Amino acid sequence: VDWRFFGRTEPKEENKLWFSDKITDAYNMPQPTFDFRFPAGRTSKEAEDMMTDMCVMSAKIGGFLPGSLPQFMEPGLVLHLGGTHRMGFDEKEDNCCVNTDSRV
Amino acid sequence: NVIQGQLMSVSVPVNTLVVDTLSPTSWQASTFFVRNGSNPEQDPLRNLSGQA
Amino acid sequence: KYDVVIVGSGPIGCTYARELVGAGYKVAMFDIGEIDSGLKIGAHKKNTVEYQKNIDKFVNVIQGQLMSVSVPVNTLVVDTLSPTSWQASTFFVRNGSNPEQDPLRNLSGQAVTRVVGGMSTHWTCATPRFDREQRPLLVKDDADADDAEWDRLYTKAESYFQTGTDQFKESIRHNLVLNKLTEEYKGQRDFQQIPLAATRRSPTFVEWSSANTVFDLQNRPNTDAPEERFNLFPAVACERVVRNALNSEIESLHIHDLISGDRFEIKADVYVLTAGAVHNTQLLVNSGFGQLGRPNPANPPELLPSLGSYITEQSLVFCQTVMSTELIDSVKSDMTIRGTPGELTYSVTYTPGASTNKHPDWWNEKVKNHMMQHQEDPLPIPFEDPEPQVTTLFQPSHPWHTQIHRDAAAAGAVQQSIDSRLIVDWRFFGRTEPKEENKLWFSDKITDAYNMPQPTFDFRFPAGRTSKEAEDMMTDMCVMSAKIGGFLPGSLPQFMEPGLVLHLGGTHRMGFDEKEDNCCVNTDSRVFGFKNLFLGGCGNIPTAYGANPTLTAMSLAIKSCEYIKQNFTPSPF
Amino acid sequence: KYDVVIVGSGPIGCTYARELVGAGYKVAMFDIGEIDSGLKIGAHKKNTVEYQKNIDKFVNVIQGQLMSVSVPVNTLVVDTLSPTSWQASTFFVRNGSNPEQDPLRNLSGQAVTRVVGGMSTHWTCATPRFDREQRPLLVKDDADADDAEWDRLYTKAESYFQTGTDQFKESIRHNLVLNKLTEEYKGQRDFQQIPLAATRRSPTFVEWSSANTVFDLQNRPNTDAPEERFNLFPAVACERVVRNALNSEIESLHIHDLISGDRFEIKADVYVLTAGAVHNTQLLVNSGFGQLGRPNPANPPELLPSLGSYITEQSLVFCQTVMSTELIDSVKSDMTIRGTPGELTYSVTYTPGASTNKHPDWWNEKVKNHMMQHQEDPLPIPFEDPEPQVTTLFQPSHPWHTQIHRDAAAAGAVQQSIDSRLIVDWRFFGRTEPKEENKLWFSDKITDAYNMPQPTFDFRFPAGRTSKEAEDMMTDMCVMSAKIGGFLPGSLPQFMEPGLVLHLGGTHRMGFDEKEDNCCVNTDSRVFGFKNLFLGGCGNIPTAYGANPTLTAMSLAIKSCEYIKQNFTPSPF
């Protein structure tokens, strides 16, 4: 049986997806680039709480299967990225790019 | 296998692995230059390497 | 001809050597293995200036003298040889594998060490006591008598090893982890330093204890003990003790000199086997005792039935952490920082003795200096800083032994890659119920490198409380380690190959009564029926224990030694 | 105060000791490492019954004492760490890596050994000679003269190391491989036993020679040598040779007693540095010879400019073959097999003395006995057959050394899956053009473990002849090896880490003239200008060599000793 536990991340201004003004990707568009680290504090705490939980919970069904021991996966492999064009009521006060109608 | 067939990495840092068992007749750079499409803007340590 | 002969030069054989040579006896000791630890015969091999400046590298010395006990026939399919290369059509016996061994009922990690000093020339030196729940009874119906007797043996045994609990008290890492775990378990669990057979010599040199510490193995008489009589004969494989037809006595020891090739017959008043848990059994089996061969409850043996049964070995989970960010910031929580590193104006200052400091003056002076003299270093922990040696001892609300420390590990790719100082090791040791069906037997057909019957194991972890405990233990390591840092990628929570831990017990087990406690030696460690045959080692422990056994095996050997000094007379000088 | 002091107790350290101690001198000898080998000091660690029965376990001991010379700053990305763990934002200098090191012009494999006896406590013992083309001239313009000198000096080295070529004549596998190869190369190529520094004792024990063979390292006078005077002081890091102002003489050796911690000045008449290619170079640079620091041509040193330059290390290709079916069948060609093995009708016979037999009676008697006594086993090679030690020596048309044999085997499944009798090792050793641009230098700010300037490599294999030859060498190993059998997976033809071969030379090289021959010692091994300072070891060898250097270093050492004897009186006893 597979266990996957999916933590949550505090949206933080300092974490960015930007594009290079000189580098280009395969389809000739500006190259995406990451400045991301998991926010210290609640996200970091929760994420390690999450691991210990997977170990507490999983133990009830059985022992780990070697070659698949409790681990953290590559950042981003989960493919659950969000907030890159985020939503709010007010652009300015809620720091966002679309409204709850999804309009820019 | 099919999944990995269509997960093309978003940002790959410039590789700095040391292969030093190459034959002396083979070409070797003196630098880790930008190659096989890695993104020289990428900080290998504040990446989302998995993002695809 | 001798008074006493010891087979084996481990810490335990030496325990007998020290008491008997000291008491006045004429003692011969044999070891199948040779002197190679340099001039201090049998000393701990980690006690060179090099290995203490290159700890990483010692793993290899340990790897190189762990010869596997029983290796099952390999059935890995290599289907990529060249068509011109020879290949058989069957998985036949090869490269010394053991055909008797069910690969799935094995203790594949089990290994043995044949070099003068034994395994004590490479051990981690953890020498804890067993609490009442892991201990065998030495007095019946008198738990205070039984407490006194053990407190007394263990205090004597600690002396012999130089066991101590404060050799690491000035490690910044040790205290950081020790303290954090104390805060965390706040009146639920007690933490203290691993007790350690070791004497600190300098801030950067520990002199680890060994068989050498217990007895210097130097032939006697000499200048320093000219009225003592002792001889260590290395490179001598002892093959067999010889019984009388009565089975009341041992008459002689048959040995095999591996330098000459020749065999001999040594005589002694007393015979003491300390050749190890695996090999004490072998010898005996090879000398009439117990059954030879695939065991057979149809035809059961007349001598020591229980020998090689109720064997125990510990479950071991293991994993490494990378110290948390919070914990690392805390190390330097007393410092005022101005400027930025590597500048002429960069300052790191603390105020000595300030009531609002969180660390003693000594710890801060180390931090401050290191930050000032190595401004290119992003960490507040000094370089030459000894490693943690943190334990929370087995209790029945957490029935396992724990080691939060650093021990010879072969750091791989992510592990020269993560800064040593961030790394901590976690080792939890489960206790195994002794069960009759768990066996160490010996082939009537196959044979080891020394033409002795081949060891074959028939072991599985008891279902029930040994197994429920084992997993509750893996889980506990996860819950607890999660307080110092996350897992070190490459060293994730895992069970280690069975026997790898090397704490096998009960192969020749102690008890008050032979049949009632299904055992092989009484509480003087003397074999039932025999008037002069004694046995030392972890194989004597009959109980379920998680803590490291050697101190307890010593303790029992001292007691056996008392019996010896009280029933046998030294021949005279 | 002594007549001679020796830095280093390796085999060349010990050549100098042997010669001078028995020539009446009073010799003091220091080594950084400790006595690490049992009661014969400097002895080979592989000479114990345990190892000769468990030879595979020995690879571990080697790695235990190969401490890497220069490790670049690691830049591996571990990005699966828990978010609570500490992570730097940089790849800072950590776990001792050398931030001067270019990871791409390194000798990553280069390592060193600190133990009394040096790398001779673990070495494979190949002691061949160099032909004219790998050989420095001892005499110019008289080839015959030169050959006379080298033969005389080589023969003495062979004497000291107990070199021979007979120890392996009665191995089947040896003979299988050597005969097949001779057949094939039809007089293009001589095949023979690797000359090996060792004496056999039983069919199953060899005494591998070492520093200890050359010289037994006991303090003197002793009973057997009451007239000789010699002292060995381990745990001492020699640090500095003190220069006169004239740069004509050394006035002392500054030493660091690692046990006490205290430092000392030791005075002598003759100073001999035998501390290894790397550390002979390191001590002299720490002593004001050569140039401390990143090398700087706009400021070239005036003392020993060529020191640390022209460094040669050998390219090394490796693989392992699983012997061909054809060759297993050939082993048993004289036998007349009937029945099916294991059944009662089954028989193997041979006609002894028969002139049509392909093998002798000893061979066939082993193959018969093995096959009748072990019907269960499918190969005709007996169980403890000695292993092959085949070589074809360096020649103009094939300018590399070749060893086809068995050394240090670290078993990774497909090498325990295959029966070890089938497995043969190939190692082919290329030669390198000495080139000024290839350097060993020392950092003026970084320090190593024993507090000395950090060595650093600027090495790449010269393009041109070395590069061409090195890849020719690979293809040759593939052509040659195919004749005995296909590669064994997990051991495919490869180039090894630069420097792992540990055949470094030219770091303190030899010539007739310092200037014109760009060198630091003369053919007496004396440092140019200095009256009483000699260097021993591969550092001396200036030329491009493929074969194993030790026996040539010892040759030069013996030559140097003779200068000494001709020019310095032993003090009176």
Ligand SMILES: *Cc1cc2c(cc1C)nc1c(=O)[nH]c(=O)nc-1n2C[C@H](O)[C@H](O)[C@H](O)COP(=O)(O)OP(=O)(O)OC[C@H]1O[C@@H](n2cnc3c(N)ncnc32)[C@H](O)[C@@H]1O
């Ligand atoms: C391997 C190891 C050991 C170990 C440890 C970590 C490692 C990697 N950490 C431990 C810890 O920190 N604290 C502790 O309590 N123990 C730990 N250990 C285990 C410990 O070293 C052993 O339990 C202890 O050494 C046992 O002592 P004992 O003296 O009873 O047995 P031995 O050390 O195995 O030595 C016995 C020897 O006698 C020999 N022998 C074998 N066969 C023969 C025959 N036929 N004839 C004569 N001698 C024989 C050996 O060669 C040997 O040295």
Ligand SMILES: *Cc1cc2c(cc1C)nc1c(=O)[nH]c(=O)nc-1n2C[C@H](O)[C@H](O)[C@H](O)COP(=O)(O)OP(=O)(O)OC[C@H]1O[C@@H](n2cnc3c(N)ncnc32)[C@H](O)[C@@H]1O
């Ligand atoms: C590692 C290895 C060696 C090797 C080989 C097998 C392996 C795994 N196979 C060989 C073989 O088939 N034949 C061959 O010719 N060589 C083989 N080698 C290498 C061989 O060991 C070396 O070529 C040779 O042993 C070098 O000997 P040398 O006499 O030049 O010195 P050394 O062995 O390196 O030891 C000298 C020592 O001096 C010490 N030392 C170093 N620095 C200091 C300072 N500062 N002060 C005091 N002593 C110092 C050492 O500790 C040391 O032991």
